[model samples]
Target chain A: SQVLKIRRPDDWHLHLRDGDMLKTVVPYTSEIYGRAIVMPNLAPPVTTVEAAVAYRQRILDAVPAGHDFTPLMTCYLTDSLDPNELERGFNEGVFTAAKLYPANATTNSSHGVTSVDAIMPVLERMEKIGMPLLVHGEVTHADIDIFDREARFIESVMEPLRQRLTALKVVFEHITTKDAADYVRDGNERLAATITPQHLMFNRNHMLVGGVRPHLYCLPILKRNIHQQALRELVASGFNRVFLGTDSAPHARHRKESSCGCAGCFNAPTALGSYATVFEEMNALQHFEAFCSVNGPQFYGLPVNDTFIELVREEQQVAESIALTDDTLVPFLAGETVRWSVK
Target chain B: SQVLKIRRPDDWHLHLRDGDMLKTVVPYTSEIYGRAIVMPNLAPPVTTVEAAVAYRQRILDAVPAGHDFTPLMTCYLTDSLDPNELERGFNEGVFTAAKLYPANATTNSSHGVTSVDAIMPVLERMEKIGMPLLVHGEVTHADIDIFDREARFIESVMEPLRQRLTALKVVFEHITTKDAADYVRDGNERLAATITPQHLMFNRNHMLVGGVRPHLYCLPILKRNIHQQALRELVASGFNRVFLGTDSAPHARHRKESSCGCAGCFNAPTALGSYATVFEEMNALQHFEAFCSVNGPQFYGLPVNDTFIELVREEQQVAESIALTDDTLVPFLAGETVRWSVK
Candidate 1:
């Protein structure tokens, strides 16, 4: 087959950043994806149920006239998380999951949870209610090497936290390193992971080699090729626990291309092609639907979208930069050609 | 003494990139240093004696009035090098040394030597004339990891090249790794190294952690903390062979703050203070002058500058950007306060 037709996918992890950025980036994902786990790391963060619901409305309004997209909101966990407030949001169905950002983990995470202990009560309530926990699984310790942050997080934070809360449902968000793939694959069904195309397709070499490519710069920063190989092998071996998440973060051109570039890759505009290229490279196209459209909803206990999207094997050129009200954003594979395109 | 004074320094490895940029940045280095090894990687490059003579005049013309500075030009080696031209340039005092940039190693290096074998005749001529070879010592192979390129180049290229031409005078220029530091220190007197202030001041984390810092990103790219520490230790050990080379390259703000940032940090303005910070950190202030002013000229077999420059222990803020004709450049340690300043 020259074409791939799968049930409309759901982005298990994403960043449809607020306002004009939301309007600028949301349509790219919503056109093909029925639902997306919108990240909560805005300037003030979506801390309250009211804020998450309001933010969800803004995202829904940004959806194009023909697309039926749902913005699955998330609560940004803080050191002093209120158990009652979290339970209320989960029961009310406003938040699909509560995100755990270790303090100073990534963008706008200054108000993130300092200690897992501080949020154990909130976790306990979520575990009782069967609501999932989405984690930005990296420790912000300055002494630890940036490349080793994820594995260290597993050993120092995740393993310990999971050991204590055995029944909790956890989705390790945007797993990049090999240790992450192995840990998730070896763990129980409750321990699933969301893998980004950037991780599966490119490594730290892509980000650092030849030049410092800001588009490939993201947190849990692209690991060494050995780890990138491990990720490719994991997906190729037909692993079902890991699903697709672009983490399609859009930063204004100025912010990303500054003296100090911000973290995150805006891959949404070319996500399907990017993932198709990876799947084809791995020769695992047969398992693509499971990773993209099936596994995520099953893990989240949500129904798979009845709608379908088709990807035809045709040459496509991703634009160098997509326009927004304030500035532009360079998407993944900008000015580069990809072999697949949505039809 | 509260005021630390050293003989006026010479940056043995520096990039005063051509034209208006050359005029814009030369004053920064010329005002502080007595001499500098000006790179030959302009748009057309300085391969001929006439070009070097012409380029030298432009550099001298750009030097502000009353600033007694000399531009030591170099021959940019290509696959088909002219030994006679190199000999003529050196014999005429037009070329101080010859630079070896592996093809596509860094910015404006397209005219670089494809293979060391291709330029043996040129190198042989330099060896006989006692003209030092300034090397941009990193392998440019696409498969070589960016972090391992320097080390591999030492093993695969530099070690073998030095072995074949044992008597050749070589400056393993702008080394960013421990392997290079150890190799130069343990090797014979014929081989020495020029350490950039940026390498001694920050590790890869400075350029990568929390944000992607383009200004600290140079060729042979900043290494891990271990490598940074090793380079610092080599300097602190009072190793006389290691001397100052700012490699202070300036790229316009638009070029630097783009999707793909160009390599080379513009450190001319902050080179002295940055080196002072390192020396003060290591508590090796006694050896600072040897590394900054004395060692470079001694290695090149020239007279040390009679004048001196004073550095005061006063706080100073680096200008965020230096303006040029059309675009501006973000300098190293820009916006960050340095504890030491040139007085």
Candidate 2:
């Protein structure tokens, strides 16, 4: 039967959290995505060159023990970030970009850049060396609404910094708001952002309409509908400022449901299917390439995914969740069926 | 001579991974939040009522020994999820809400909800039974831009579902976009999103601009600065539709940095300070309570945090990624400094 054959995609942002999770998730992405810009916000957020190297090895090890898919690595950035070390790491092929979290911005960001101004030395160095900065773009303000913090932070933090470090290439980690989308779209050629499925579909309300909701909880948390609408416009605007980044984080069941469950979703297995459903629904299947491949690479001065994959409109029901060890499992839209699947 | 001081604030979202990492990080988050909505997306994604109970006990076992914090539990939703089981769990006070992750949406989410429609039976039961559905809002669509995926998913996956289950209470967990911000603000009575430090600050460009960065990365990844800005506005707007959920998921250093490192940030160490930083920057110190205490309780239909905690401004610095072991470690800011410290 005739089906939709598409270019094999590259995951702009993906997490194969080493070991079993990595092994389990990699195959799916590898089969579909030719390359994935693996996130470096590990427990400590991959900071060292050695760490990037070792981490890459583990990915290689987990790649079905042998798969051609390539995993581009990134370095974690902090205030104490050393340009020399970063340069060394880049030269060593350990990382392609520097991951920056404004102190405690997300999961393991306790060690993130606390003061962007204080890190000028490092940023200046990156600017001179043509290094890129991928940021988690919400203001870590306690009083700000979760929905408005990102914009406020940008006006106060990112915008000022961008003005100061005009030459420093930047990727606004994940773009979720209307202004966020516009800023990335309007930013210099060096700027871009990564988006995820959760923000694309649901706002903060999805997390607490009834009771203590947690699984849907994550950093750079979801915003309101207008912002969601803006994001869709950004995608259709055909700008290279935005791209795909699954940010496919995974965690075990016991760890997730316990008191203080870790923040992240294990979206590796059905990644392609997830995207297929999204595109199928947006009626933007044709524009998928720009968001999926072109926009990301162009922003980073990299190449789009070279290979192509196939997606089918089959009646494949994505699992509600998977049970990892301890008989714990994560719900992936638990008890739901999608209109598409990856072939 | 001193600021108002009271009991430590409760963390709505906190993650304590297992074993060594858990041993290391639990102490940090516990040091702050007295209560946290523990996630259930462990490797197996905690599913059973018995499992949640046992997991809570185990979390107690792992609570840095002398911690007085409580780990709120959750039920992982699945395609075959039994509403009765959930009802029993909820009635028994085992969990606050039922977590529903779209299949393969994030870390350990393989067992998540496959199809919203498929799980309508369970959802209907939940709605009738008055069980809230915690959602990982991002829809997994391969071709969609990572930045826009969340927005896309909402239109295709969530809105329809929301309409389908308008009466069914839902929690749109950690939201990261301006769209999310707007939506939650507009639909406060029914929907809301959590604001994480990461989403409050770093955007995709912050991470992507510098090359394949890692530490600043996490699933439901950060959105663009505009989204960040929107979040700030919403939070600053002081709507009850917003709240705090750290999603402080932690991973071992090895998992975050290996060749195929996991995608997560360990922010348990400084969520309070992170929020403080953002609030301080936004001049919205007064709104902090709504985000940290009031909103969550209101969302969960619980009382606001009885005890207030003082977040003090101090010359403070978190480790640049703590050592998981002698050989491996998790990263925080790597080398960063912030303006606040929890007393």
DockQ of each: 0.78, 0.03
lDDT score of residue A197 within candidate 2: 72
What C-alpha lDDT, on a 0 to 100 scale, does residue A40 get in candidate 1? 95
Q: List per-prediction Cα lDDT, in the order shown.
A: 0.88, 0.71
Clashes of each: 1, 240
Candidate 2: chain B TM-score equals 0.93
Candidate closest to the true structure, highest DockQ: 1
TM-score of each: 0.97, 0.53
Candidate 1's DockQ: 0.78
TM-score of chain A of each: 0.97, 0.90
For B204-225, candidate 2 gives per-residue lDDT tens digits of 6554331234465676767767
Identify the CAPRI category of the predicted complex in candidate 1: medium
Q: Which candidate is the best by TM-score?
A: 1
Identify the leading candidate in terms of lDDT: 1
The TM-score obtained for chain B by all candidates, in the order given, is 0.98, 0.93
Candidate 1 Cα outliers beyond 4 Å, as residue runs: A104-110
